[PDB]
């Protein structure tokens, strides 16, 4: 079994590199963030432009949706995070506290909290209602590349250029586990599996690794792609066949069989590094976005 992802739409509009694409939990929309300081909303099924959301003073590295699809959070080079009302496009809160670029962000499932990672090497936990910083974790010794809550929001996983993956207890702010491997190459991306039992981690040695973080064992390795410079988003594709999806520095979207580790498809079309990929919550749809020499978002559809 192999998917047959085929190009459906090319979404043009960003004037600089696209940095992150995410599907709304309700599947109706795709949100994109960019170095052009804008957040754009698109129709997930027709690729139709919906609206531009603005307010950040500098480029945005990440955007994330709340569980009800009503809010977005964005992480910017301006050292802040902003919480946006999607329907109005209005900035509800500006989260201030990071002392360097904000790189990654996510809401917890309950969506009362936001987790952020910054070049300031810290991980911050924010209260959505007040915009107050609840906890500052001295998480890593280098820029924090990714932060993600697990399925029940009890845990946060963070990754850094320091070569470590750390699992944190959300309520206590304490570090539960540190994952180290080989010679500690920079960790460019991390996220929990949908069941929260595993973590998918990308390293700048052209490798993706599936970890059983509690047992501290690497179960699978995904290679063949190019990843030595950028913090490229990777995903678990679960709507059809069980795949691992990632962008690559060779301008391709890579799709591996989760179990066998074999490359099942390479999606050609982008003209620059595919920095971000996202998997649709209900349909076999992939959104992919590329850097400065491309600046577009592509929507791909598969039968499986």
């Amino acid at each position: 079994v192999k998917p047959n992802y085929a190009l459906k739409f090319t979404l043009a509009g960003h004037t600089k590199a696209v940095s992150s694409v995410k599907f709304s939990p309700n599947g109706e929309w795709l949100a994109s963030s960019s170095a052009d300081k804008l957040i754009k909303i698109w129709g997930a099924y027709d690729g139709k432009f919906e609206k531009t959301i603005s307010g950040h003073k500098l480029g945005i590295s990440d955007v994330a949706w709340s569980s009800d699809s009503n809010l977005l959070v964005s992480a910017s080079d301006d050292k802040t995070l902003k919480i946006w009302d999607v329907s109005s496009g209005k900035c509800l809160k500006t989260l201030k506290g990071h002392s360097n670029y904000v790189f990654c962000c996510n809401f917890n499932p309950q969506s009362n909290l936001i987790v952020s990672g910054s070049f300031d090497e810290s991980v911050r936990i924010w209260d959505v209602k007040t915009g107050k910083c609840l906890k500052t974790l001295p998480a890593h010794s280098d820029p924090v590349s990714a932060v993600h809550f697990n399925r029940d929001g009890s845990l946060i996983v963070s990754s850094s250029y320091d070569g470590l993956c750390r699992i944190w207890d959300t309520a206590s702010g304490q570090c539960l586990k540190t994952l180290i491997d080989d010679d500690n190459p920079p960790v460019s991306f991390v996220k929990f599996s949908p069941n929260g039992k595993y973590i998918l981690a990308a390293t700048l040695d052209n490798t993706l690794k599936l970890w059983d973080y509690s047992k501290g064992k690497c179960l699978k390795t995904y290679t063949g792609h190019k990843n030595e410079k950028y913090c490229i988003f990777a995903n678990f594709s679960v709507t059809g066949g069980k795949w691992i999806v990632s962008g690559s520095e060779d301008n391709l979207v890579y799709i591996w069989n989760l179990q066998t580790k074999e490359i099942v498809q390479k999606l050609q079309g982008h003209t620059d590094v595919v920095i971000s990929t996202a998997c649709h919550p209900t349909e076999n749809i992939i959104a992919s976005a590329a850097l400065e020499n491309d600046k577009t978002i592509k929507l791909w559809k598969s039968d499986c």
Binding site: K16, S19, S20, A35, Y101, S188, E228, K229, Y230, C231
Partner: peptide, 9 residues
């Protein structure tokens, strides 16, 4: 630019 689009050095 943005920190993510700049990349690692």
């Amino acid at each position: 630019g943005s920190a993510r689009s700049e990349g690692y050095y």
